Design a protein around this motif. Structure first.
Motif, PDB file in Angstrom:
ATOM      1  N   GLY B   8       0.828  -1.190   0.000  1.00 45.11           N
ATOM      2  CA  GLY B   8       0.000   0.000   0.000  1.00 45.11           C
ATOM      3  C   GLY B   8       0.857   1.233   0.000  1.00 45.11           C
ATOM      4  N   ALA B   9       1.400   1.576   1.171  1.00 46.38           N
ATOM      5  CA  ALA B   9       2.466   2.577   1.267  1.00 46.38           C
ATOM      6  C   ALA B   9       3.617   2.149   0.344  1.00 46.38           C
ATOM      7  CB  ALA B   9       2.942   2.743   2.708  1.00 46.38           C
ATOM      8  N   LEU B  10       3.999   0.869   0.441  1.00 46.42           N
ATOM      9  CA  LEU B  10       4.917   0.218  -0.488  1.00 46.42           C
ATOM     10  C   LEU B  10       4.544   0.487  -1.954  1.00 46.42           C
ATOM     11  CD1 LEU B  10       7.351  -1.741  -0.828  1.00 46.42           C
ATOM     12  CD2 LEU B  10       5.751  -3.626  -0.494  1.00 46.42           C
ATOM     13  N   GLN B  11       3.256   0.336  -2.287  1.00 45.67           N
ATOM     14  CA  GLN B  11       2.744   0.685  -3.612  1.00 45.67           C
ATOM     15  C   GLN B  11       2.872   2.182  -3.903  1.00 45.67           C
ATOM     16  OE1 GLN B  11      -0.602   2.446  -4.012  1.00 45.67           O
ATOM     17  NE2 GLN B  11      -0.242   2.658  -6.211  1.00 45.67           N
ATOM     18  N   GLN B  12       2.491   3.010  -2.910  1.00 48.18           N
ATOM     19  CA  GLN B  12       2.410   4.461  -3.092  1.00 48.18           C
ATOM     20  C   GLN B  12       3.810   5.088  -3.272  1.00 48.18           C
ATOM     21  OE1 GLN B  12       0.168   6.456   0.068  1.00 48.18           O
ATOM     22  NE2 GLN B  12       2.004   7.250   1.100  1.00 48.18           N
ATOM     23  N   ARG B  21       6.831   3.161 -11.886  1.00 42.87           N
ATOM     24  CA  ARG B  21       5.473   2.728 -11.459  1.00 42.87           C
ATOM     25  C   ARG B  21       5.414   1.209 -11.215  1.00 42.87           C
ATOM     26  NH1 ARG B  21      -0.630   3.331 -14.236  1.00 42.87           N
ATOM     27  NH2 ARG B  21      -1.612   2.532 -12.332  1.00 42.87           N
ATOM     28  N   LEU B  22       4.863   0.825 -10.049  1.00 42.38           N
ATOM     29  CA  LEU B  22       4.491  -0.556  -9.752  1.00 42.38           C
ATOM     30  C   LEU B  22       3.497  -1.042 -10.799  1.00 42.38           C
ATOM     31  CD1 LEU B  22       4.554  -3.035  -8.026  1.00 42.38           C
ATOM     32  CD2 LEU B  22       2.734  -2.072  -6.601  1.00 42.38           C
ATOM     33  N   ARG B  23       3.891  -2.080 -11.543  1.00 39.36           N
ATOM     34  CA  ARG B  23       3.132  -2.631 -12.696  1.00 39.36           C
ATOM     35  C   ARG B  23       2.374  -3.901 -12.284  1.00 39.36           C
ATOM     36  NH1 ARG B  23       2.744  -5.881 -16.818  1.00 39.36           N
ATOM     37  NH2 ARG B  23       4.639  -7.105 -16.448  1.00 39.36           N
ATOM     38  N   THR B  24       2.933  -4.677 -11.351  1.00 33.82           N
ATOM     39  CA  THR B  24       2.465  -6.020 -11.075  1.00 33.82           C
ATOM     40  C   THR B  24       2.933  -6.417  -9.703  1.00 33.82           C
ATOM     41  OG1 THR B  24       1.871  -7.284 -13.065  1.00 33.82           O
ATOM     42  CG2 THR B  24       3.555  -8.286 -11.630  1.00 33.82           C
ATOM     43  N   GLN B  35       6.359 -11.221  -5.062  1.00 32.33           N
ATOM     44  CA  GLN B  35       6.971 -10.845  -6.337  1.00 32.33           C
ATOM     45  C   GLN B  35       6.477  -9.468  -6.757  1.00 32.33           C
ATOM     46  OE1 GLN B  35       5.283 -10.412  -9.543  1.00 32.33           O
ATOM     47  NE2 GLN B  35       6.938 -10.829 -11.062  1.00 32.33           N
ATOM     48  N   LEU B  36       7.398  -8.502  -6.857  1.00 28.97           N
ATOM     49  CA  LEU B  36       7.076  -7.185  -7.391  1.00 28.97           C
ATOM     50  C   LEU B  36       7.639  -7.001  -8.782  1.00 28.97           C
ATOM     51  CD1 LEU B  36       7.209  -4.630  -4.507  1.00 28.97           C
ATOM     52  CD2 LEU B  36       5.471  -6.341  -5.097  1.00 28.97           C
ATOM     53  N   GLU B  37       7.059  -6.043  -9.509  1.00 27.41           N
ATOM     54  CA  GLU B  37       7.374  -5.791 -10.903  1.00 27.41           C
ATOM     55  C   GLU B  37       7.200  -4.306 -11.119  1.00 27.41           C
ATOM     56  OE1 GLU B  37       8.151  -5.261 -13.628  1.00 27.41           O
ATOM     57  OE2 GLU B  37       7.319  -6.549 -15.221  1.00 27.41           O
ATOM     58  N   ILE B  38       8.312  -3.572 -11.140  1.00 27.88           N
ATOM     59  CA  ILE B  38       8.295  -2.130 -11.287  1.00 27.88           C
ATOM     60  C   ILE B  38       8.736  -1.795 -12.703  1.00 27.88           C
ATOM     61  CG2 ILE B  38       9.209   0.067 -10.467  1.00 27.88           C
ATOM     62  CD1 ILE B  38       9.549  -1.278  -7.707  1.00 27.88           C
ATOM     63  N   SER B  39       8.079  -0.790 -13.293  1.00 28.41           N
ATOM     64  CA  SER B  39       8.290  -0.406 -14.675  1.00 28.41           C
ATOM     65  C   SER B  39       8.701   1.050 -14.742  1.00 28.41           C
ATOM     66  CB  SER B  39       7.014  -0.632 -15.490  1.00 28.41           C
ATOM     67  OG  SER B  39       7.306  -0.879 -16.853  1.00 28.41           O
ATOM     68  N   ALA B  40       9.374   1.393 -15.853  1.00 27.62           N
ATOM     69  CA  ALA B  40       9.765   2.756 -16.177  1.00 27.62           C
ATOM     70  C   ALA B  40       8.698   3.386 -17.075  1.00 27.62           C
ATOM     71  CB  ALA B  40      11.113   2.753 -16.884  1.00 27.62           C
ATOM     72  N   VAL B  41       8.508   4.702 -16.920  1.00 24.28           N
ATOM     73  CA  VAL B  41       7.709   5.513 -17.836  1.00 24.28           C
ATOM     74  C   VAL B  41       8.540   6.723 -18.297  1.00 24.28           C
ATOM     75  CG1 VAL B  41       5.498   4.702 -16.959  1.00 24.28           C
ATOM     76  CG2 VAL B  41       6.573   6.690 -15.897  1.00 24.28           C
ATOM     77  N   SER B  42       9.842   6.474 -18.516  1.00 24.68           N
ATOM     78  CA  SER B  42      10.844   7.474 -18.910  1.00 24.68           C
ATOM     79  C   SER B  42      12.032   6.773 -19.628  1.00 24.68           C
ATOM     80  CB  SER B  42      11.299   8.284 -17.686  1.00 24.68           C
ATOM     81  OG  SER B  42      12.079   7.494 -16.796  1.00 24.68           O
ATOM     82  N   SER B  43      13.281   7.119 -19.263  1.00 26.67           N
ATOM     83  CA  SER B  43      14.504   6.546 -19.890  1.00 26.67           C
ATOM     84  C   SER B  43      15.840   6.128 -19.217  1.00 26.67           C
ATOM     85  CB  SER B  43      14.603   6.727 -21.429  1.00 26.67           C
ATOM     86  OG  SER B  43      15.733   7.508 -21.805  1.00 26.67           O
TER      87      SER B  43
END
Lengths: 77, 80, 77, 74
Positions: B8-12, B21-24, B35-43
């Motif tokens: 939650g806070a972990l998500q936020q 951004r947390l994707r999954t 299992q966490l899965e964090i994604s980029a929305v940049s470079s």
């Protein structure tokens, strides 16, 4: 699958189910105060899916125009 | 409930960091595996705004196993 | 009464349950796209009532910053 | 290249260094994760980014990880 179709259609019509308890081949439902039009749409939809309304007792909410409490509701396949 | 409740806070604070951004997210109580899965929305924000994040874990009752990064705007954490 | 408490708390947190099917001491739930924070508040509430989260798999809704689809959710007593 | 100089500046060692065209596949000894990131972030400055990175947190570790895979580019 009777409970699943009930719940899916409930959500589709803006209603909230609280209790879903069988009493032999029929299910006793407890439902939150609802817009009567939405309730009817929901029961009509269930009718088309092979769950008929066996019992239905509703009272108008004062002072909410268009809304009812669902006092009794028993469905059957 | 140091496992569930820290989501939650972990998500936020993940989603709050400018760039990523947390994707999954996956939890299995039986297998004790988060299992966490964090994604980029940049470079290149997934390396910059990341070192920081491994100070956030290990201040409660953590679970950290591996961390795979495969630049498909991709970062795969495991808190097992 | 386990199903009732699940559903009442779901409504209290703005969530919609679509399917509620047992395996045994565990219930597999299907849940509509949700605000992740609300989802956790809900599961945390259920945790306090003696139903713990056995499995949870969520994916972010890519165009909605705080929201997820609930891929899997299994509760256990 | 200043991979090796910066490695030394952040404590601990590169063992194997094989190119595959504009990218370098490294084998690196178990490291303090914080130091590893400081190192990679330093390499990031002035060019040369982390393309791939896979680490496991070696058991009985106040902050340490083994570097399973590491590939740099530029």
């Amino acid at each position: 699958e009777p409970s699943t179709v009930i719940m899916r259609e409930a959500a589709r019509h803006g209603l909230t189910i609280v209790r879903l308890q069988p009493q032999g081949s029929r299910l006793s439902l407890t439902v939150q105060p609802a817009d009567f039009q939405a309730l009817m749409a929901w029961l009509d939809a269930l009718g088309q899916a092979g769950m008929t309304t066996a019992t239905l007792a509703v009272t108008a909410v004062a002072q909410q125009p268009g809304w009812v409490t669902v006092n009794t509701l028993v469905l059957e396949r | 409930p140091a496992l569930i409740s820290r989501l939650g806070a972990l998500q936020q604070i993940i989603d709050d960091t400018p760039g990523i951004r947390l994707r999954t997210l996956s939890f299995d109580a039986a297998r004790n595996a988060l299992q966490l899965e964090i994604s980029a929305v940049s470079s290149q924000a997934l390396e910059q705004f990341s070192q920081r994040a491994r100070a956030r874990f290990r201040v409660q009752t953590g679970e950290m196993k591996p961390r795979a990064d495969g630049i498909e705007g991709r970062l795969t954490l495991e808190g097992a």
